[PDB]
């Protein structure tokens, strides 16, 4: 698939929706981003950074009216330059739950509460994208 890639989420997200993204991190990658959007707002931005001051960190945030909020940072970093990955995002009633390569990574509490209006997922950054899909579990 071509990156950046837009995956419509018809009728928005709902609990029990599972989104699966398969790809490969480019060699010498700098960044990856998943952006769950509600119009121009970003309900959930998931942003692995491969070199922020010589550290690897995952940054999560929300953008409302063109302003970023308080960052939530995770130092557990399961991505590896040059290697294949699987990201699974499970929507639960009170948070997005993220697993990478079948291991739980983080949860992100819903800040945007109109889940039905979060109707697009953008995928960008330094990856080759193989598949992006959803199902109900
Ligand atoms: O909050 C998320 C946003 O962060 C900003 S950078 C943000 O800038 C601030 C000053 O305005 C602070 O400097 C902020 N900070 C917070 C801390 C910090 C330090 C210590 C702590 F303990 C906690 C936080 N140390 N920097 C720093 O993260 C990115 O620009 C923005 N972004 C990324 C992308 C993107 C596009 C395409 C991609 F493929 C991938 C990503 N498109 N927009 C998005 O990620
Ligand atoms: Cl809302």
Curated annotation (Swiss-Prot):
Domain Galectin span(s) in chain numbering: 5-135
Residues with Phosphoserine modification: 75
CC per GO annotation: cell surface; collagen-containing extracellular matrix; cytoplasm; cytosol; extracellular exosome; extracellular region; extracellular space; ficolin-1-rich granule membrane
A Gene Ontology BP annotation from the UniProt entry: positive regulation of mononuclear cell migration
Tissue: A major expression is found in the colonic epithelium. It is also abundant in the activated macrophages. Expressed in fetal membranes.
Keywords linked to the UniProt accession: Acetylation, Cytoplasm, Differentiation, Disulfide bond, IgE-binding protein, Immunity, Innate immunity, Lectin, mRNA processing, mRNA splicing, Nucleus, Phosphoprotein, Repeat, Secreted, Spliceosome
Location within or outside the cell: Cytoplasm; Nucleus; Secreted
Binding site residues for a beta-D-galactoside: 68-74
Motif Nuclear export signal per UniProt: ranges: 113-128
GO molecular function: carbohydrate binding; chemoattractant activity; disaccharide binding; IgE binding; laminin binding; molecular condensate scaffold activity; protein phosphatase binding; protein phosphatase inhibitor activity
Free-text function comment from the UniProt entry: Galactose-specific lectin which binds IgE. May mediate with the alpha-3, beta-1 integrin the stimulation by CSPG4 of endothelial cells migration. Together with DMBT1, required for terminal differentiation of columnar epithelial cells during early embryogenesis. In the nucleus: acts as a pre-mRNA splicing factor. Involved in acute inflammatory responses including neutrophil activation and adhesion, chemoattraction of monocytes macrophages, opsonization of apoptotic neutrophils, and activation of mast cells.
Subunit structure: Probably forms homo- or heterodimers. Interacts with DMBT1. Interacts with CD6 and ALCAM. Forms a complex with the ITGA3, ITGB1 and CSPG4. Interacts with LGALS3BP, LYPD3, ZFTRAF1 and UACA. Interacts with TRIM16; this interaction mediates autophagy of damage endomembranes. Interacts with cargo receptor TMED10; the interaction mediates the translocation from the cytoplasm into the ERGIC (endoplasmic reticulum-Golgi intermediate compartment) and thereby secretion.
Name this polypeptide is given: Galectin-3
Gene name of the encoded protein: LGALS3
Entire protein: shown range: 114 to 250 of 250
């Amino acid at each position: 698939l071509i990156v950046p890639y837009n995956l419509p989420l018809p009728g928005g997200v709902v609990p029990r929706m599972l989104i699966t993204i398969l790809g490969t991190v480019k060699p010498n990658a700098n960044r990856i981003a998943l952006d769950f959007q509600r119009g121009n707002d970003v309900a959930f931005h998931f942003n692995p950074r491969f070199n922020e001051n010589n550290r690897r960190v995952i940054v999560c945030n929300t953008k409302l009216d063109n302003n970023w909020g308080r960052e939530e940072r995770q130092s557990v970093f399961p991505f590896e330059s040059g290697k294949p990955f699987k990201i699974q995002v499970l929507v639960e009633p009170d948070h997005f739950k993220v697993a990478v390569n079948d291991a739980h990574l983080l949860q992100y509490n819903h800040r945007v509460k109109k889940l039905n209006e979060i109707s697009k997922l953008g995928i960008s950054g330094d990856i080759d994208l193989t598949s992006a899909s959803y199902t109900m579990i």
